[PDB]
Amino acid sequence: HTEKRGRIYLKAEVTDEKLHVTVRDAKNLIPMDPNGLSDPYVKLKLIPDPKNESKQKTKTIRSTLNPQWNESFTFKLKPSDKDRRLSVEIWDWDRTTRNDFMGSLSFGVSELMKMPASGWYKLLNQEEGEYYNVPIPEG
Numbered sequence: 576h577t578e579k580r581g582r583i584y585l586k587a588e589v590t591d592e593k594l595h596v597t598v599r600d601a602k603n604l605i606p607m608d609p610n611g612l613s614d615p616y617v618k619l620k621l622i623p624d625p626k627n628e629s630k631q632k633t634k635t636i637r638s639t640l641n642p643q644w645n646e647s648f649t650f651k652l653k654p655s656d657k658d659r660r661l662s663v664e665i666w667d668w669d670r671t672t673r674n675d676f677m678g679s680l681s682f683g684v685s686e687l688m689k690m691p692a693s694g695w696y697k698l699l700n701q702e703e704g705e706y707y708n709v710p711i712p713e714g
């Protein structure tokens with residue numbers, strides 16, 4: 576169900592004291608719906624975020640194993656924000672059965688404040704997607 580064959584294109588770069596994040600698209604996804612395709616929406620949050628007001632989501636794609644979102648946001652928080660973790664979840668919206676989770680990713684904010692994390696990324700599991708950072712070349 577969680578297949579680490581899919582790759583998600585995430586970019587987080589700090590410019591003018593604003594964290595300009597970008598979610599371009601993903602490729603090599605697995606069939607998650609009865610349609611034989613996937614229809615995921617990306618949620619970008621700065622954890623811990625229990626009230627999920629930092630968590631911003633994009634809209635779902637029709638039906639494609641290569642969903643393209645092309646969203647970009649700008650969220651900076653007071654200096655304590657560097658201690659947070661930028662966790663991005665990939666959930667498929669299903670009214671038929673259940674939301675299909677294939678994977679997620681996370682970036683260290685202290686890392687992003689010193690260097691912009693921009694490129695492809697591998698699908699991490701739920702435990703990993705809140706902690707680890709593993710950027711993938713894919714090019």
Ligand SMILES: [Ca+2]
Binds near residue numbers: 607608667669675
């Ligand atoms: Ca599904």
Ligand SMILES: [Ca+2]
Binds near residue numbers: 607668
């Ligand atoms: Ca779906």
